[PDB]
Every structure is written in C-alpha cells, then in structure tokens.
C-alpha cells in the first residue's frame, strides 16, 4: 500500500493537479542460508524462540531476529518452555544456557 518492501515512512510532494508520495521502505538484502529447527530439546523440555528463530551455521545453534541476521546465544531469556521433546516434529538437541547458573555457583 505504501511502496514495495516493508514500509518505514512516506513524504508528500505537491504536483500539478496531483500528489507524489515518496515511500521510504526497508528491503532485505544479502540473505544467507542457515539450518533451522522449530524447537530446541534441553533437559527433556522443548524451548521455543520468544521473538526470533533458531538458526545454525553448521556446527553451532543461535537465535536471531527474523528480519536481520544477529546471532545470539540460546538462553532462557529469549526462549520459553512448553512441553517435552516427544511432540514437536523436528526438534533437535542443543544446550540452553542459564544466565543465573554462574551466579549461584559463585
């Protein structure tokens, strides 16, 4: 409706008997393949991304936002737990880091 791509903003310009809209949009570019999984199996529990997606560069698993590649460590702060690993089709085994875990250890 407001240009090709994800619409960011628009600017109006007057024209003889008309209007010209300059649509400023965000276009994704330089995409890269990654291996993806619906959920992460850890300690018999299924972890799902809170806002992003699980991606793998070949050996390690990360969670990133869907519209830009920004890999982050899969922790308990950006994932949520729902059920065990027996139900979700395609769940893979990976560790889930706990930020509180070094705190009570020390």
């Amino acid at each position: 409706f407001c240009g090709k791509g994800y619409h960011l903003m628009s600017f109006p310009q007057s024209a003889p008997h008309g209007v010209v809209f300059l649509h400023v949009t965000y276009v994704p570019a330089q995409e890269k393949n990654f291996t993806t999984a619906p959920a992460i199996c850890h300690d018999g529990k299924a972890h799902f991304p809170r806002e992003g997606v699980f991606v793998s560069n070949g050996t390690h698993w990360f969670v990133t936002q869907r519209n830009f590649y920004e890999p982050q460590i899969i922790t308990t702060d950006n994932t949520f737990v729902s059920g065990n690993c027996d139900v979700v089709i395609g769940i893979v085994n990976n560790t889930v880091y706990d930020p509180l875990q070094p705190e009570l250890d020390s």
Partner: protein, 50 residues
C-alpha cells in the same frame, strides 16, 4: 514475440533450511496520484445559442 512473464526463480525449498537477511537497502519509490481536474464551466445557453 510471446511476452515473457518474468525471470524464473526456483526457490531452494527444503524442510529444515531458512534464508536470513544479513543486510538491508533503504529504498525510496515514487507514487503519482491525480487529485483534481481543471474546473470547467459551460454556459449551456451561450454554447448552444450564443
């Protein structure tokens, strides 16, 4: 000639692969929309009869 609908692009679909963008383009496009016409008035008596 027979007109080409477009360039063929077979998306590499598989059940466990995703494509994530690593960059972006800020694209500005133009959209021209007419708003008004010239306001014309015709005197019917003067047009038909002078």
């Amino acid at each position: 000639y027979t007109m080409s609908l477009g360039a063929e692009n077979s998306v590499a679909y598989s059940n466990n692969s995703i494509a994530i963008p690593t960059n972006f383009t800020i694209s500005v496009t133009t959209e021209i929309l007419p708003v008004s016409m010239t306001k014309t008035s015709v005197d019917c008596t003067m047009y038909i009869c002078g």
